[PDB]
Curated annotation (Swiss-Prot), chain A:
A GO cellular component annotation in the UniProt record: cytosolic large ribosomal subunit
Family statement: Belongs to the universal ribosomal protein uL6 family.
Organism: Thermus thermophilus (strain ATCC BAA-163 / DSM 7039 / HB27)
Keyword S-adenosyl-L-methionine appears in the UniProt entry: no
Record Pfam families: Ribosomal_L6
UniProt record, GO biological process: cytoplasmic translation
Name this polypeptide is given: Large ribosomal subunit protein uL6
One of the record's GO molecular function terms: rRNA binding
Subunit structure of this chain's protein: Part of the 50S ribosomal subunit.
UniProt keyword terms in alphabetical order: Ribonucleoprotein, Ribosomal protein, RNA-binding, rRNA-binding
Swiss-Prot record, chain B:
Subunit description: Part of the 50S ribosomal subunit.
UniProt xrefs under Pfam families: Ribosomal_L13 (PF00572)
PROSITE patterns: RIBOSOMAL_L13
Species whose genome carries this gene: Thermus thermophilus (strain ATCC BAA-163 / DSM 7039 / HB27)
GO molecular function, one term: mRNA binding
Name of the protein in its database record: Large ribosomal subunit protein uL13
Cited HAMAP family: Ribosomal_uL13
Originating gene: rplM
Keyword Lyase in annotation: no
Keywords: Ribonucleoprotein, Ribosomal protein
Family named by the database record: Belongs to the universal ribosomal protein uL13 family.
Protein task: This protein is one of the early assembly proteins of the 50S ribosomal subunit, although it is not seen to bind rRNA by itself. It is important during the early stages of 50S assembly.
NCBIfam families: rplM_bact (TIGR01066)
GO process terms (BP): negative regulation of translation; translation
Swiss-Prot record, chain C:
Organism: Thermus thermophilus (strain ATCC BAA-163 / DSM 7039 / HB27)
Keywords assigned: Ribonucleoprotein, Ribosomal protein, RNA-binding, rRNA-binding
GO biological-process terms attached to the record: translation
The family this protein is said to belong to: Belongs to the universal ribosomal protein uL3 family.
A Pfam family this chain is assigned to: Ribosomal_L3
Name of the molecule in the record: Large ribosomal subunit protein uL3
Function: One of the primary rRNA binding proteins, it binds directly near the 3'-end of the 23S rRNA, where it nucleates assembly of the 50S subunit.
RNA sequence: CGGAAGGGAUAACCGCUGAAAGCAUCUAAGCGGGAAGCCCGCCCCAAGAUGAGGCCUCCCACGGCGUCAAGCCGGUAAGGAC
RNA sequence: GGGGAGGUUUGGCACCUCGAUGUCGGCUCGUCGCAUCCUGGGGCUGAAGAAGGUCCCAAGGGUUGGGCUGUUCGCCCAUUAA
RNA sequence: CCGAGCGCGGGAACAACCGAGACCGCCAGCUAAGGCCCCCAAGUCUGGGCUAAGUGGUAAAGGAUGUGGCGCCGCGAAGACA
């Protein structure tokens, strides 16, 4: 957590960083020990349900910080014949197959650029929004279960 | 020959709800709805503290009741069984959930219906600042 | 939520370009905004239109204070269009451009104490081979023992007509400011000389 | 002319982040999408909604017995009825 | 080969009813159930597409006119989203 | 045991299930089954564990990283599981 600003609250934890600051409401029944330049979490037992709540907010926070450290960037590949992307301003329009070319709305806290009409990045301070926004884009045109057309990740096709 | 009390003056009571478990708050509300707490007790004359409740829309209820609890109201026509859970109850007229709880724990009959005009539930808080309001816990 | 009152003068048909448009005629003789409804002190919004002039003879009722309060010639009838607040004056037919579609309420023709065959286009029985005491009868009404009651609202012989009804999405065909008439699509409840309210439609 | 549109909560189901369990998991915290079905929406009923509502406007003291008590008697106001 | 569920089938027992509980089939009027015929929503597929198979969700609505037959049933005929 | 105790208490209601053999009186007390948050008399009594399904609030074969609890075996700081 270099250049961060971890803080304490009744039921949440704020994350100050170059990118910005995001609310991250964590578990109530834990410790949010903030040392000099390191952040830890302790659990008030060793129960079945406390193990889960410990490791959960032990990463979620490691992400709350990693959200304003270097920022996320979720790729999305486009394959096909007419299939090609196009950033119309801050929003992304694309032609995939349907009669009309659908336009993607800008979600708050997420600006998506483009390397190719075939490659599609998705920045985002929160890692929750980054994956949510990016899956919704795969939704529009889900992979050709017989060819190789539509939306993809860097995660192997279907064939 | 046992005492048989005379005329009395009602004692309206200011009761919260914020945090208070449903039935738990339901019971006491009703036990007070009559006079089982007043040894000046009489099981037919009706002299229960006018129970008044604010912020009723703020009642915690156990397990998964909210999504689970199902209030059933039947009309006369077929399929007239309208099924309505807590979730819908709270978001609409919330004060009503803590109503049927208490009315459904009161003596069922004539004076029982008397022991209902005594019940003054609301959502706000705020209520008829009227004349009496003894805040109970 | 536009809204204007009127009556049912009568109906015939016209010819648009070269095709025939069977029309009915509504009458929105200038209507006086008699009272309005501000949630501020009412609980909602709605403007009560008055209708049809009236000699202060039957107006002897305390309604006269009510008109004189709103500086309104003493009408004969008045109802509430929902959330229809125009401006400090009165509403003509200028409200409805020709073509606009209208929802049209109205009270239906009272068909007395009518029969099942009539009320509920029931089937009754066979004009033929037996019984000859049921030819316009309802038939059976229930089951054997269970339940042993009859369904609340089992279509049976009662009154048919004289009920509030609406008919909707109607093409206002023409509008006559010159003399306050309203052309629609023809099928509009109630008899002639019949009171009826009309308002902007439910399409979107 | 209508069966809608559309708003919301969902069924099976598809998903984001993610422990327990160094991986993974649609989940146990949190979140999103998802039926002609559910809830509004539409139309009609509706304050005997004895919990009898609200809004605008109009009339307005005793005229006599009942001291104390609610009452009781003829005339009246708005207006209603015949 | 095993375990059930339902209480529509054929029975079993003879409990109420023999100082009477009118049985089949149709017409009329239906109502309810889901284990869904169709229309809407899904998983899989030995799913290219179209089509179809199976499981799941789902009663809201719809579920045809005749030939024969006392028929319920079924066969057939012309359709049907069914 | 009912029948002949459809007299009483409990079991919601229910001759035969648990309780108990009604001679009459009482606005006296102990108890039984049974219960003790409210409809309802009397503990929201004390103490320790379990269950998260509304299980409780009534079903079987059969199925599973449900939860807690107690044991056996292989592997590992000469470095394993992932």
């Amino acid at each position: 957590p270099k250049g961060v600003s971890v803080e304490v609250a009744p039921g949440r934890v704020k994350v100050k960083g170059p990118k910005g600051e995001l609310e991250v409401p964590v578990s109530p029944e834990m410790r949010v020990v903030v040392e000099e330049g390191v952040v830890r979490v302790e659990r008030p037992s060793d129960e079945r349900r406390h193990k889960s709540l410990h490791g959960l907010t032990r990463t979620l926070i490691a992400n709350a910080v990693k959200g304003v450290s270097e920022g996320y960037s979720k790729e999305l590949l486009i394959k096909g014949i007419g299939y090609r992307a196009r950033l119309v301003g801050r929003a992304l329009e694309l032609t995939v197959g349907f009669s009309h070319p659908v336009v993607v709305e800008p979600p708050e806290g997420i600006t998506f650029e483009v390397p190719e009409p075939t490659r599609v990045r998705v920045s985002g301070i929160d890692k929750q929004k980054v994956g949510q926004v990016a899956a919704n884009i795969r939704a529009i045109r889900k992979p050709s279960a017989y060819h190789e057309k539509g939306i993809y990740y860097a995660g192997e096709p279907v064939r | 020959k046992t005492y048989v009390p005379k005329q009395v003056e009602p004692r309206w009571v200011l009761i919260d709800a914020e945090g208070k478990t449903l039935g738990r708050l339901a019971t006491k509300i009703a036990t007070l709805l009559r006079g089982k707490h007043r040894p000046d007790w009489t099981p037919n004359v009706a002299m229960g503290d006018f129970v008044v409740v604010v912020n009723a829309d703020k009642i915690r209820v156990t397990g998964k009741k909210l999504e689970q609890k199902i209030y059933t109201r039947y009309s006369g026509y077929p399929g007239g069984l309208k099924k309505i859970p807590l979730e819908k109850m709270l978001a609409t007229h919330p004060e009503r959930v803590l109503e049927h709880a208490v009315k459904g724990m009161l003596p069922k009959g004539p004076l029982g219906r008397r022991l209902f005009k005594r019940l003054k539930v609301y959502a706000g808080p705020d209520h008829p600042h009227q004349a009496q309001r003894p805040e109970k816990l | 939520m536009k809204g204007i009152l009127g009556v049912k003068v009568g109906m015939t048909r016209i010819f648009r370009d070269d095709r025939a448009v069977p029309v009915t005629v509504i009458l929105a003789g200038p209507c006086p905004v008699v009272q309005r409804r501000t949630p501020e002190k009412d609980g909602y919004t709605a403007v009560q239109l008055g209708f049809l002039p009236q000699n202060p003879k039957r107006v002897n009722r305390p309604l006269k204070g009510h008109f004189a309060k709103a500086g309104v010639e003493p009408v004969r009838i008045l109802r509430e269009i929902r959330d229809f607040n125009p401006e400090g004056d009165t509403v003509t037919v200028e409200i409805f451009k020709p073509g606009e579609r209208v929802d049209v309420t109205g009270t239906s023709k009272g068909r007395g104490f009518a029969g099942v065959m009539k009320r509920w286009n029931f089937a009754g029985g066979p004009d033929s081979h037996g019984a000859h005491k049921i030819h316009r009868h309802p038939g059976s009404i229930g089951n054997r023992k269970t339940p042993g009651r009859v369904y609340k609202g089992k279509k049976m012989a009662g009154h048919y007509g004289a009920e509030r009804v609406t008919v909707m999405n109607l093409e206002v065909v023409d509008v006559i400011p010159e003399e306050n008439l309203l052309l629609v699509k023809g099928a509009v409840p109630g008899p002639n000389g019949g009171l009826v309210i009309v308002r902007e439609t439910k399409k979107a």
